[PDB]
Structure 1
Amino acid sequence: VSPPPPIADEPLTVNTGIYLIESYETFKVNAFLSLSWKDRRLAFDPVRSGVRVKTYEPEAIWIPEIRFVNVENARDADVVDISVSPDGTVQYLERFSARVLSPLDFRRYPFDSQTLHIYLIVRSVDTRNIVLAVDLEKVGKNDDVFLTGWDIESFTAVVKPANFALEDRLESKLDYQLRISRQYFSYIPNIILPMLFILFISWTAFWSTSYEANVTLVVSTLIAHIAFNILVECNLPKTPYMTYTGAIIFMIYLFYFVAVIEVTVQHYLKVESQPARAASITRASRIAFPVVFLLANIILAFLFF
């Protein structure tokens, strides 16, 4: 079957709509794709037919070749209904389960908001040009729409389509945006708190002179920090980009090094009989370490938010 012919030179407007049935660090969505276009070749008089509307099969009529852009593979398509109104207006409906192929911006994790994108595309034919449109009454989401650890803020579409030329033929692109924000509250007692306790347990080598107990304090807590980093391996990003957590983790690895330097220096001074000077440093460190940490954290929080 060929596409419907133009009354005049005008292109075929396909009224699209996505409504999230079920939505569920990667994302998959189960939804309704609704398509509507006018094919007069199908028009009928209800009187001769004895039907308000005629229900067709996908094979029977011309259906626009609507493809998705960023998704895993050929969509799990299931046609729900095909309805033609006496005028030849085609009301298509399909149910599709699809994997969201968008990278997340981990730069502000775990205090971030993401915008998941769903791209609808149609390539225009030799016969006539096809353009995409949005039926706002056919764009939404159910309420059973859950995404554990996230707050589903919106499901909206950029109404104005992206029309552009590709391999000498025109293409019409549409942008569906699932905007989500994170449920950060558990991060404190699970990730930052114990990581901070381990670093604090190290800092008690600023009220000690025993190099044996001090080596054992700083070094043994370096092992505990690394093991805890492996414990929360999942909840920490794979990112090749600068991240808020990444720098905070890095800063900690540096603070374990500075603490070793102080400890080492202090012991060297004591061996060297400048104990008044060493005890001065170990005394300063009791306020230096927690103050530079709290400043550097505030510096970073500003640098990332």
Structure 2
Amino acid sequence: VSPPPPIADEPLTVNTGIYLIECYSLDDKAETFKVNAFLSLSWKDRRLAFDPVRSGVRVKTYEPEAIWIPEIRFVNVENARDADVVDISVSPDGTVQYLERFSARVLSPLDFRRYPFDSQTLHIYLIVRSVDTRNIVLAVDLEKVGKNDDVFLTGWDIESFTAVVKPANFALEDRLESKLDYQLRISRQYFSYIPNIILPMLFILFISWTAFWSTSYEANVTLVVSTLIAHIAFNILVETNLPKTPYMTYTGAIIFMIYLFYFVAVIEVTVQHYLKVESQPARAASITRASRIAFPVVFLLANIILAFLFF
């Protein structure tokens, strides 16, 4: 078993296809996803040609060991795919039709900038390394690229699964490599975040703003310090569900900005008390009255500016 010889000097074309069966375990922190799919391969090996008159069968079936099979790998995998060959069917001209079902943990990076209103392009890169005897090139058989309707990725919407038909042919360590880009387009189901994180977080912030209708320093301290603690709890929760990015994320920006609002409300509460104690409640009263409008107005504008910057 060695590669099929060329009729001229042409490279050997391996037609490929990936059909997704199961898509699961999309880890945001790890920037990985698990995939269970069909991998279909097709090439001509004239040495396998037969007469069905003589052989008695129109199509021959071979075991992987019996014939030459191209060493196909995935670029962006943790470990080599766990594959089980489904069928190897040889037609009288020497055309080999290979099918396997595999499972792999794919490493494809994610862009969390718009999180949790973000979309991703997951990649599955198919590769073949050319042999000394002859050069191997990958092709996309669009008829054999797809996914079933059952394919469900928890907390995501699956938009598309397509292949970039033109392979990336390049030199690596004195040999040729033919790379294929299978792109799985997905968009996050942002719903859950609103009642689970966003609105709870806004409610505690608004609770802190009731200190602007209070003259009790002891109560105001309790209000603004306690809501701040509840915010720290949400911040920790959020940062446990996300990786450490070298950029700011949308949720991250909002969460951070709210700390500034808590900080300024502590300043306001302090200023109001100091003046009241210094026997000038008229100044304290005018600051507190301004705060009642300024805090929500600045909050609303800051958020518009933020949303504008991110989307």
Q: TM-score, normalised by structure 1?
A: 0.97
User: Is the Cα–Cα contact under 8 Å of residues 80 and 104 in structure 2 kept in the other structure?
Assistant: no
What is the CA-CA distance between 1:183 and the residue it aligns to?
1.1
User: Could you list the per-position Cα deviations for residues 65-113 of structure 1 after superposition, in whole angstroms to 9, with x for gaps in the alignment?
Assistant: 1010101102101000001110000000000011121121111111111
What is the CA-CA distance between 1:229 and the residue it aligns to?
3.3
Name the residue aligned to 1:133: 139
Distance (whole Å) between structure 1 residues aligned to residue 256 and residue 239 of structure 2: 15
User: Is the Cα–Cα contact under 8 Å of residues 115 and 251 in structure 2 kept in the other structure?
Assistant: yes
Is 1:156 the counterpart of 2:165? The answer is no
User: Structure 2 matches for 1:233-244, cutoff 5 A?
Assistant: 234-235=240-241, 238-244=244-250
Describe the SS at the equivalent of 1:114: strand
Distance (whole Å) between structure 1 residues aligned to residue 236 and residue 128 of structure 2: 46
Distance (whole Å) between structure 1 residues aligned to residue 82 and residue 174 of structure 2: 30
Is 1:11 the counterpart of 2:44? The answer is no
Moved more, 25-34 or 74-83: 25-34
What is the CA-CA distance between 1:35 and the residue it aligns to?
0.3
Tell me: CA distance 1:159–1:186, structure 2 relative to 1, closer, same or farther (3 Å): same
Describe the SS at the equivalent of 1:10: coil
- State the Cα RMSD in Å: 1.3
Distance (whole Å) between structure 2 residues aligned to residue 80 and residue 41 of structure 1: 22
What is the CA-CA distance between 1:205 and the residue it aligns to?
0.4
User: Is the Cα–Cα contact under 8 Å of residues 17 and 140 in structure 2 kept in the other structure?
Assistant: yes
Describe the SS at the equivalent of 1:290: helix
What is the CA-CA distance between 1:278 and the residue it aligns to?
1.4
Moved more, 222-231 or 271-280: 222-231
Distance (whole Å) between structure 1 residues aligned to residue 233 and residue 124 of structure 2: 39
Distance (whole Å) between structure 1 residues aligned to residue 136 and residue 277 of structure 2: 84
What is the CA-CA distance between 1:274 and the residue it aligns to?
2.5
User: Structure 2 matches for 1:42-81, cutoff 5 A?
Assistant: 42-81=48-87
Tell me: CA distance 1:291–1:237, structure 2 relative to 1, closer, same or farther (3 Å): farther
Distance (whole Å) between structure 2 residues aligned to residue 100 and residue 297 of structure 1: 36
Distance (whole Å) between structure 1 residues aligned to residue 308 and residue 289 of structure 2: 30
Distance (whole Å) between structure 2 residues aligned to residue 10 and residue 26 of structure 1: 37
Distance (whole Å) between structure 2 residues aligned to residue 237 and residue 132 of structure 1: 35
Distance (whole Å) between structure 2 residues aligned to residue 165 and residue 232 of structure 1: 43
Distance (whole Å) between structure 2 residues aligned to residue 101 and residue 178 of structure 1: 13
What is the CA-CA distance between 1:231 and the residue it aligns to?
4.7
What is the CA-CA distance between 1:234 and the residue it aligns to?
4.6
Alignment: residue pair count: 305
What is the CA-CA distance between 1:232 and the residue it aligns to?
5.0
User: Is the Cα–Cα contact under 8 Å of residues 214 and 220 in structure 2 kept in the other structure?
Assistant: yes
Tell me: CA distance 1:301–1:239, structure 2 relative to 1, closer, same or farther (3 Å): same
What is the CA-CA distance between 1:21 and the residue it aligns to?
0.8
User: Could you list the per-position Cα deviations for residues 3-26 of structure 1 after superposition, in whole angstroms to 9, with x for gaps in the alignment?
Assistant: 011100100000000000111174
Distance (whole Å) between structure 1 residues aligned to residue 167 and residue 106 of structure 2: 20
What is the CA-CA distance between 1:236 and the residue it aligns to?
5.1
**Structure 2 unaligned blocks of 5 or more:** 25-30
Percent identical: 99
What is the CA-CA distance between 1:241 and the residue it aligns to?
2.2
Distance (whole Å) between structure 2 residues aligned to residue 154 and residue 136 of structure 1: 14
Distance (whole Å) between structure 2 residues aligned to residue 103 and residue 11 of structure 1: 33
What is the CA-CA distance between 1:233 and the residue it aligns to?
5.2
Distance (whole Å) between structure 2 residues aligned to residue 87 and residue 68 of structure 1: 29
User: Is the Cα–Cα contact under 8 Å of residues 22 and 37 in structure 2 kept in the other structure?
Assistant: yes
Tell me: CA distance 1:237–1:289, structure 2 relative to 1, closer, same or farther (3 Å): farther
Distance (whole Å) between structure 2 residues aligned to residue 231 and residue 29 of structure 1: 28
What is the CA-CA distance between 1:129 and the residue it aligns to?
0.5
**Structure 1 unaligned blocks of 5 or more:** none
Q: TM-score, normalised by structure 2?
A: 0.95
Describe the SS at the equivalent of 2:179: strand
What is the CA-CA distance between 1:276 and the residue it aligns to?
1.5
Distance (whole Å) between structure 2 residues aligned to residue 96 and residue 155 of structure 1: 17
Describe the SS at the equivalent of 2:192: helix
Of 121, 142, 149, the match for 1:143: 149
What is the CA-CA distance between 1:122 and the residue it aligns to?
0.4
What is the CA-CA distance between 1:235 and the residue it aligns to?
4.4
What is the CA-CA distance between 1:223 and the residue it aligns to?
1.2
Describe the SS at the equivalent of 1:233: helix
Name the residue aligned to 1:22: 22
Describe the SS at the equivalent of 1:241: coil
